[PDB]
Symmetry: D2
Subunit: 393 residues, 4 copies
């Protein structure tokens, strides 16, 4: 059939919970990256066939957050858009959907990624429409129930990370060591300007002044040490191993890529960043959802006819050190090539955006080191994984 290529890539910086992006709605972050990614590609808004954006947390967001991002980015009304939710998989699954559509001949050019503002997620009042005839009622945190809580077992994602830690023998000390590594890798990449090219600024309005650009991954902890972690108390289970320091955060951000067939890029005179080599999803038991990247990455590698050793660089999302370590244990690949600029423990985890955020990061680093074969993969609440492989000439 047809090869799919990525012609451009952009992300916002990732905001801390209640931080610099907390008052900017997720679609407005999405618009920043859709607009930037098209500019970078040299593609006019009217040439876009569709926009697909992941967003998990949509309570009170208004009709179709992806359409809002597309319109706010300047795209004309003739360009249709769809919002998707595959939890942390969303941002990457959008690119997968774009590739399916191009391959099927349903679309020519697709802007795909994800957008999330966890800070702005509201509380919801279940049963409000009916009323509360007697007795107390509950205001439920949508960020938790819709973003972070397993339906089937009724406990937090952090408990799934405890389950994975026990199953694969991932100790508290190894978690913390992995977490310090991520922070120091991120600090080192940040301090050396390595995130400069991939980040586009978001202008934050200021009461009686000009807006200020936000363009730094403010969640990254500089000068992080093992000692600053090894004393912390477990966050989710009193006898447990997972802490605030060895899990990712609650974060805000967006990321997008522009996708088209290789034949279309050549028709337009565009040199692609990379070819999409393969992609795959996978399902696992919700109890061990952090393991999804294993069967997903294995399926993606098999579709690519690659081995884990053929890879030059990977981005494997760090929702929890416990799960990222188990994944590395089970894949057997070389971890000096994974998250070389740090991961989500340091950078943050805006759930519906991360899938494309890590792809953006992967592509920019590949180019910088002239890596030829890369993979991005993430675990997914409710027991899934997605993985996508890219190849450079």
């Amino acid at each position: 059939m047809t090869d799919v290529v990525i012609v451009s890539a952009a992300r916002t910086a990732v905001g801390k919970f209640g931080g610099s992006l907390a008052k900017i709605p997720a679609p407005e972050l999405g618009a920043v990256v859709i607009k930037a990614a098209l500019e970078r590609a040299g593609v006019k808004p009217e040439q876009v066939s569709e926009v697909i954006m992941g967003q998990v947390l949509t309570a009170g967001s208004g009709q179709n957050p992806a359409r809002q991002a597309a319109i706010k980015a300047g795209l004309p009304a003739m360009v249709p858009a769809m919002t998707i939710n595959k939890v942390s998989g969303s941002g990457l699954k959008a690119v997968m959907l774009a590739a399916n559509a191009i391959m099927a001949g349903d679309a020519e050019i697709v802007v795909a990624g994800g957008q999330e503002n966890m800070s702005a997620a509201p509380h919801v009042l279940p049963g409000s429409r009916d009323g509360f005839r007697m007795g107390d009622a509950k205001l439920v945190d949508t960020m938790i129930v819709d973003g972070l809580w397993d339906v089937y077992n009724q406990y937090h994602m952090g408990i799934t990370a405890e389950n994975v830690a026990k199953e694969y023998g991932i100790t508290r000390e190894a978690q913390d060591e992995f977490a310090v590594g991520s922070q120091n890798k991120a600090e080192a990449a940040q301090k050396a300007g390595k995130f400069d090219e991939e980040i586009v600024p978001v202008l934050i309005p200021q009461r009686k002044g000009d807006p200020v650009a936000f363009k730094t991954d403010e969640f990254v902890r500089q000068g992080a040490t093992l000692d600053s972690m090894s004393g912390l108390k477990p966050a989710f289970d009193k006898a447990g191993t997972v802490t605030a320091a060895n899990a990712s955060g609650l974060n805000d951000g967006a990321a997008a890529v522009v996708v088209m067939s290789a034949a279309k890029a050549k028709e337009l005179g565009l040199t692609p960043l990379a070819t999409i080599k393969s992609y795959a999803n996978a399902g696992v038991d919700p109890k061990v959802m952090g393991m999804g990247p294993v069967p997903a990455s294995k399926r993606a590698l098999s579709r690519a006819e690659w081995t884990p050793q053929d890879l030059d660089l990977m981005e494997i999302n760090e929702a929890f050190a416990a799960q990222a370590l188990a994944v590395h244990q089970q894949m057997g690949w070389d971890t000096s090539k994974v998250n070389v600029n740090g991961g989500a423990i340091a950078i943050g985890h805006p759930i519906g955006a991360s899938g494309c955020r890590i792809l953006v990061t992967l592509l920019h680093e590949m180019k910088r080191r002239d890596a030829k074969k890369g993979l991005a993969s993430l675990c997914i609440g409710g027991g899934m994984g997605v993985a996508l492989a890219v190849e450079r000439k």
Copy 2:
């Protein structure tokens, strides 16, 4: 390219607002129809490659509503699922994504549809994290803001219907006539048992008694007359034309179809209900979103190399009589072949499910009258349409 077929199709009856389905969460509705479509197909749950369900209103619904439906339907954890939101387009867009993934080689068997419980939609409290230092605060109705309110113009979907009525000269009296036709057609279909085959029952628990089977479209008003409608006051604009009787309702329901390649159905010994001939989306100005089906249906017909006159049967969703009538005026096709068993004014409009609900109704009627060429289409809040054409041997 690979031909994609639909091998089975099932819907719940549509519940009234606060009616028989009001306490059954949308993913339980989806489960009922996923499970029945697979039974009807003769496809085991472990054969399924992916589930894709639309659901618009997801506040407090828990992680990834489509996964919830899949798991509740008895599908194993290895089967991935994803939720989508293209407003009222969702349930039909789901089927489109399924066909894309089959044609691309990404999936083999997909269960695709939509699910919605508008009755259960809650209120949300924006700003609840920060708190309310002084003064009052708004509890926002998610059904309205997320389902029924245009972002760009900040008014109800009903005003977009008034815009269309004005633009296209659709009178109050023409709307009411249409609406009475739809109710009378739905009444005739009910009395004749036309919906018996497509409807699968939902068992409604009863306090100290056996569950009761809900299996009838309880929103349908039997004995509807013009005099019952022509006296009502307009619902959205005091000088307008759109009333509660010539617009659809707020409703609960779900619908699903099982999709696979023609080669796969042959291998499995399955006789399809139909082949998917073509499909398309479209964008239009949000102010006239009701017109979405015109460019969508023209693109789908074009892709099929059919003309409007080639069609034997259509299902064009009746969000508002005003928009359904403008769509017919612009397409110029034979309206005696449209919504022959009634439409949403009568049956209801569970937004995230409607696009698959109408597909289910189309396919069952096509089979009963031996129609060969069909089309389903819907408008979409924010200014879009989708359309899908099917063909039977």
Copy 3:
């Protein structure tokens, strides 16, 4: 100092929970009875020195509910008013404060009573001003927390009634005979027109035609039998004696009397309903709050130099059969003189009003029988009692 007289008495009928008064704010109910009590007394609004109304549930009620009722009853701005809260004692305590003011020469004519709309009580959101940075938050039922919940032991008034039943050996059977007696006596009183004179109609706006006059104690169960109660489940504790049928309900209503010195009444040419003989409060352990009426009634009788046997008629509130029966047990008086027209189990218990409601009922029955000596008393959540004795010449 002075003899204090009651010149007039009026009450609304008592509304069922969510029933006929549920949409009428408490001060508007209080306005009804203040206006009516003054017309019945022959006292014009500008002669009033003060208005004192009990209201327990005042969340979102607006500034000073008693002043609202006074203004709404047509009293001029020059007449001050005060709201009080002694839980169920409130409505009677108002009368006691009125009589103190008069005896001290602080006031001349006082309208005193209480008003309550339990149906309209809202939920509150504690911590709302600081916000809920992460996690679920509680909407607290003000009816329960402010009206019905013991602060010190953190359980329902119904558990205090279980405590009383156990300590004084009041059995489930005793309680149910008491409760059926109350229903039957109320039904007989309604048939005899006993409440025709005391009740002031409240006009209730209707969907269609003219407002309907609400003027009947609609909570009273006609044709109640022992068999309808002896089989029910306990309402507050598995091992309990207290049920929905042997406790009163959640109710709406108001009541007021007009109070002044005997000398002021003769100077104005008015004939009193009765003279206030004495009154008292008392405190008991919160655990057995239902016994409050014992030390309160003993103190009032002692202040009157009367014996329990001197009484012709008593109104002793029946929040719970369990506590009313223990009160009777400890006082030793003839229970056939008590609540002769039925009590709160049948009529209902609008908490801030009930203390004057029962006095109103007492005074009208005393007149009709030409009884000479009476007493009203109530228990009070948090461990108190109030009692007040009246004499007719």
Copy 4:
């Protein structure tokens, strides 16, 4: 009826909105002053006949806040208590009711005052019991609606201040100058230690450390100048005179006095702080509620047979400089004898407590300077005033 005397007086320091007392519920503030006032007087908890506490904002506070203060202060269950609401009049009115009760013979020893935590007042959800079938709902601020908002005119207390400013010609300049005066007087009293004796410390738990003694009027702004006020935006009306600096604030605190007959204090060997000479209430138009102290103070002076010139010392509450100035203009009294240690503009205005707070301040300063004739008065939302005159031998 003998004279009534005040044997002791105690208050907390006044907290700023969201300040040092913010997390201490009102009845706990109440408890501090009840216990202290009894200790100062030499009265054992079990000798108390009744506790009477003002508290305006009671939404979710639990049953009978006055009783809660009494029990928390260590008074036995046998001591009855009552909460009252006459808005800002509440705390002085409680003393008035205590005096009426002693004169009447009803009580012997009464603890009276008020308590308020405005910081902690929650939001309420009106109609929550019935639910919100469609459309947005409103969370309402109970501080504003129950404490600060005029029922009849539907506007803030600040607007009643603007009414008084216009009607009595009280300029923006005159108001800023008065306000600078109050702040400067309070500053000097803090440096001098004039409040040392009246204030009782409240221990604020620290999380990190031992609990800190809160014992200073932390709202007082030291170094206040005319220049810091004279350019501020009006806070309530655009064409207005009232600002955040010439009005008091939103505050937390409690105060109580112990009251008994002169004969009783002699029997117990107790030296009064003062004799209650007289007291009065009054009503005015809600629109001009700030003038309430005029007729209340004239009525109280009249019952005392005093003239305004007879007074050695006054405490007239400063809700708004606009009304305090109008009150002084109408009474004609010596303003250098009013609020000599500063007033509410500086000290703060915890509404249900302020009427006792100013009395506590009055009594301590009267003793310090050997003043013989004193008076305390405040305005009341909804159009009222209260005044109480005291006399030292």
